[PDB]
Design a protein around this ligand. Structure first.
Ligand SMILES: Nc1ncnc2c1ncn2[C@@H]1O[C@H](COP(=O)(O)OP(=O)(O)OP(=O)(O)O)[C@@H](O)[C@H]1O
Ligand SMILES: Nc1ncnc2c1ncn2[C@@H]1O[C@H](COP(=O)(O)OP(=O)(O)OP(=O)(O)O)[C@@H](O)[C@H]1O
Ligand SMILES: [Mg+2]
Ligand SMILES: [Mg+2]
Lengths: 702, 702
């Protein structure tokens, strides 16, 4: 059972949850520190992605320089040992750091950021040790040549940066600044994780509006306009710190990092003129992007089920699974470009075709001079440099269809098997490389029957597999605009994203919906099901246990009955008069404070502010299993009146489940009371309004 | 009193408001027709903006060719008569069509699209005659050289296209297609007006994600993900139809239209490298954009107040106000470039400086050959061509500071006076030209102390005045990206948009908030005020008249008492048992159907489907003042049970006004019932939850 998050506002001024109801210094202190924390989320995600890209380009660049040194001496067996050994060693570093120190840093974190911004309290997700294992595990596993990026891990790294900046450092290492007392809300934490995840998609692609639109469209359930401006400011500070550190280390000051433009996979030197002959391969790239994105979603759901059978078997088995996946990745990225025959160097293409090194197009791996290997252009590089080889402006029929089919089938296989291993893996770059493969294949199959470039058909195929897997339209359009710098490919990119989202929704759910189902996270979707308009929430509460209520002045003994014997996290406060909803955290707080009255007396509001500060009520640093309540003190009384949420959101008994789900998910509820049309008769949570748990208790509905 | 819109769903299956609760053909008929209508909104807004841009570039281009023909013969007095006469004639065409035929086509329509998508039933806004007067009035007033664009009018024109496509043509000219019966909802109309307004911002700037983000950020209050995809599809079909009609008429096939690129004001051939010396003029352009945008918002509020004093005085006075504004515009766009001395032609600048014609940079208006007039480059062109003269890549110190100050002070004066006249005017292009003026002035004032181009400082100044007036961040960033094609100016554009929104919010509201206040439209803002957490909705209902309720089986005489003597649009249905909320429209419908029972009988559900189709309940084609109810029939009975919204949204009496405003504006309510903690005690509408009407009844709150 994962608990939800409390984003509702107790409108008593003992709690001071509304930030505008504070002092005029403290409104200014909140406004200054939330824009400072948006600037610091931008500065720290930009600096960490600078250090991640510097370490990945230096380690994988010097590995491929050593591998190409043994390749250029025609020693192809000991260049396989250097490639397989450095990739096994970097995956061994990333996997002993994940499975022995921070196992929630495995995967991208985006299905549990989208769980957390929907209001599910996902444990161990945003920590310091989770952040540092994800930093050096992306530094290990992207430089180990694997089919993953540092793109999705940066979304988890930026939201981990945001939670440590908001709470003030690591847990039991926090500074006790009094100005960080206003970000102890769950609804101010949700703003921070939204700005940090948007800064992570901006640090992924050098994409500052597509980070804002990935948060809006995917991960954030609730959106204000006052968040979008700080989310905007966080992504602006990221891409400024990123492109300033591509402006520095331009003259080779930082090793092999920075030899490259400000714009990642910049294709912008081509004309995009729309013709009526290219309607048919553009919708074919959309239809095959939705079909292969649905097939990738179904086969990754099956692969992550069989990898969850390995992930429960032990912690040495996750090491051996990912080292076997990394051994398979390095053997098939080294040995498979021997199957491609060397194409000769085309004089119609502008730039230099006899090219050896660590990066660049037209690799010269097992060929004579004046020839190039078109498979080792893509397999024996980094995964980001292989995108720009497929994405190349004005290289017509560079890759053959056999080498494109080998690179497609390999990155289908490595797209399935490298996602579910226990490194910080991701889904932006493998789905980009699979879509690049079939998009360049459909561009090469129309040999001089089209006027769109084959490297532009690659961008259309990559955006179609990203729409066919993730079912997104607006966020990946600004992501592929801020990657590829083509403003005229943008409406054709819009058409292939919409065709692949609609062909993809015919078969599967989204790929973030699939891992949210597979991790068991209780996600609450937007539109209710049409059979929830026929079920009532009075009928939903008769299929439930009765309401564990409290009084206004309870005894201590009944409060420890509802705290020992129940697992519920809010309780209605009664007495013939519903007062509201007290929380479990405030019940453990009044047991730990020992604010115990000898008579049934409603206290005044000077007796509560002497016992409870607004920083005392917001702290969740209480456990129930330390309080030794003496049995003389169990016949004393606690006034539960001033700690009650005296205005909770209610529904009537005659309210339907579809309208109650709409109020539960629009205003951000954790507990919705049910009153009659006994002043309370029911209480609805997220578990009662998810459609799967309704269809357990009511199988006769659709 | 402007009524709100009914976007709530009656979950009885007599009404069939949920589209998924229909037949399997009709779910497919709704899905096919909503994507057909999104394609048709895209096709018709792209074709109408093609015809608007074709007519504006041919009429104003041949006017400026005739004016430059009299200028090149050194006949400067009869070129003033051709300029003033054609601008007075085109403004006379636009003003007799606005003030005598469709006076809601005056202005941009964006403060009453944002009213309509907030759920205020703005009358006479989306019609056919309003659309056609706005088409030929933008064709008149942009070709009359005025300080307005066809940018904001296209937002009203695309939403007018959307409402006529959704309802099936003009009012009392609609086709009676049975497949258009599902778009008779107000919540399906709201989806249409959102797709049409997004298609209008896309037809404004050739900007297909910035249209989607202008709807999200500004005009649409409620946002689903299932709308964003059809809104995405509508803007994709617009910019495809727009750029296909720039691909055709490229060889002069359509007159003077199409001589120009696919990208409007394309500046993309410059490097944007960030330096630490240019931190200070970039934040100076942001601070002056917020300060002059606040000063423009305050002075346009005063000018529109004094123009509302002219707009009530008659219909010939609005003609004479706009003809005097157009006479002042043409005299000061012709005569003021004689005050600028001719700068000589710089050989450091690449392209051709002795340039005469109708368009282009470096105009040669009153000069000798080898010289150019830098004021007639901006004043004696079209308003869009004068943007690209300021926005010019690599023209260093082209405009002098005196000519830039004359163009700034003129477009400040003409930005105030040409907005409130009764042509279809707008605010995107005058605020762009004012911000271009001071942005190029701050670029020229740092003479070789900066490395950002002076035409790029223009884009920063234009985005700062657009943020200083409209208080937007994300939508104008994609609008200026899809205009200027500079992906590296984009984070500097983000910084000047955020600095000018935050300096601008220190003084004023937004410029759409100001005309929403000035037109008296009851807009409902997102966050409640902090004094609404201390007021209760039980206390708000004791400062109100008591509840005009109904019974379940009322008499006819009590139904005509609540329909004659009240103006309320929903009534609670009682009897010791609250059933729900029947609407006023269903009460007039059961009086017009004459479903009158002789006894107090609750009917069965076969008696209602014989009397009421689901297309009969959705039609609002009923007036109350035609029904002649006989006094024998007033002692009969109507079963108001099957027409009731039996699950309305309720609050308790102890609920605060701040949480009730949050539920009113999140789920899209028109009537929120108040139950006790008499099963109803109150009913809240939009008027009760606006903060201004609370502060009338409760002045002691903050
Ligand atoms: N005070 C309460 N009294 C009785 N039932 C409750 C109470 N609170 C929650 N429930 C019900 O008990 C079931 C278990 O919910 P749970 O114990 O998880 O509540 P919770 O932990 O407060 O909610 P969440 O886990 O969503 O934060 C739910 O179906 C819910 O409706
Ligand atoms: N059935 C009703 N009985 C009593 N008062 C009502 C009823 N409906 C609305 N009111 C109240 O009367 C006042 C005037 O509202 P109005 O007459 O405009 O209702 P309405 O027209 O149904 O709502 P709207 O105009 O927002 O659609 C409001 O303050 C509202 O709270
Ligand atoms: Mg629980
Ligand atoms: Mg009314």
């Amino acid at each position: 059972h994962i608990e939800s998050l409390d984003y509702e506002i107790n409108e008593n001024d003992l709690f001071k949850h509304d930030w505008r109801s504070r002092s005029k210094a403290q409104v200014f202190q909140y406004i200054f520190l939330k824009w400072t924390l948006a600037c610091l989320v931008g500065l720290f995600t930009g600096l960490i992605a600078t250090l991640i890209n510097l370490a990945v380009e230096n380690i994988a660049g010097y590995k491929l320089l050593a591998v190409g040194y043994y390749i250029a001496q025609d020693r192809f067996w000991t260049g396989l040992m250097v490639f397989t050994g450095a990739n096994l060693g970097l995956t061994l570093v990333a996997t002993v750091l994940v499975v022995y120190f921070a196992p929630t840093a495995a995967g991208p974190g985006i299905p549990e950021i989208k769980a957390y911004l929907n209001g599910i309290d996902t444990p161990n997700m945003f920590g310091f040790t989770t952040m540092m294992v994800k930093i050096v595990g992306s530094i290990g596993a992207v430089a180990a040549g694997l089919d993953l990026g540092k793109e999705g891990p940066l979304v988890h790294i930026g939201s981990c940066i945001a939670s440590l900046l908001g709470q003030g450092g690591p847990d039991n290492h926090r500074i006790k600044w009094r100005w960080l007392r206003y970000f102890n809300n769950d609804r101010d934490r949700r703003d921070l994780i939204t700005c940090g995840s948007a800064s992570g998609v901006c640090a992924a692609f050098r994409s500052p509006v597509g980070g804002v639109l990935f948060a809006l469209e995917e991960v954030a359930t609730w959106w204000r306009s006052a968040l979008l401006w700080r989310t905007f400011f966080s992504t602006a500070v990221v891409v400024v710190v990123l492109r300033a550190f591509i402006e520095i280390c331009n003259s080779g000051k930082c090793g092999l990092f920075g030899s490259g433009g400000l714009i990642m996979f910049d294709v912008s030197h081509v004309e995009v003129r729309y013709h009526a002959a290219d309607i048919i391969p553009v919708t074919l790239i959309g239809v095959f992007g939705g079909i292969l994105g649905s097939l990738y979603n179904h086969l990754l759901h099956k692969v992550l089920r069989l990898y969850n059978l390995i992930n429960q078997k032990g912690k040495i088995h996750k090491v051996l699974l990912s080292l076997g996946v990394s051994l398979f990745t390095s053997v098939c990225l080294f040995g498979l470009p021997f199957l491609a025959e060397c194409k000769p160097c085309d004089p119609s293409i502008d730039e230099i075709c006899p090219t050896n090194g660590r990066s660049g197009n037209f690799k010269q791996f097992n060929c004579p001079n004046g020839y190039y290997n078109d498979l080792s252009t893509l397999l024996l590089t980094t995964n980001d440099d292989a995108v720009r080889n497929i994405f190349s402006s004005n290289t017509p029929n560079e890759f053959g269809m056999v080498s494109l089919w080998i690179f497609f089938g390999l990155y289908c296989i490595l797209g399935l098997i490298t996602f579910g291993i226990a490194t910080p893996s991701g889904l932006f770059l493998p789905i980009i490389l699979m879509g690049s493969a079939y998009g360049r294949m459909l561009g090469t199959a129309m040999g001089s029957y089209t006027n769109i470039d084959q490297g532009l058909y690659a961008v259309l195929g990559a955006a179609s597999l990203m729409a066919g897997s993730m079912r997104m339209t607006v966020s990946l359009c600004v992501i592929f605009l801020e990657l590829t710098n083509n403003l005229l490919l943008l409406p054709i990119t819009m058409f292939v994203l919409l065709i692949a989202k609609t062909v993809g929704d015919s078969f599967n759910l989204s790929i973030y919906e699939i891992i949210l189902h597979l991790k068991g996270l209780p996600f609450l979707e937007a539109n209710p099901e049409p059979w929830m308009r026929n079920l009532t929430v009075g009928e939903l509460n008769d299929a439930k246990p009765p309401v564990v209520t409290l009084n206004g002045v309870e005894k201590v003994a009944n409060i420890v009955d509802v705290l020992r014997n129940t697992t519920h996290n809010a309780f209605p406060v009664l007495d013939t008069e519903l007062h509201g909803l007290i929380l479990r955290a405030h019940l453990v707080k009044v047991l730990k404070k020992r604010w115990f009255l000898n008579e049934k007396r409603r206290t005044e509001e000077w007796e509560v502010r002497e016992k409870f500060t607004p920083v005392e009520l917001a702290e969740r640093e209480d456990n129930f299993d330390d309080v030794a309540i003496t049995s003389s003190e169990m016949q004393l009384y606690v006034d539960l009146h001033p700690l009650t949420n005296t205005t909770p959101y209610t529904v009537v008994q005659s309210m339907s489940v579809a309208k109650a789900l709409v109020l539960f998910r629009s205003v951000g509820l954790r507990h919705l009371l049910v009153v009659p049309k006994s002043p309370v008769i029911g209480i609805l949570t997220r578990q009662d309004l998810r459609a799967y748990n309704i269809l357990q208790a009511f199988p006769h509905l659709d």
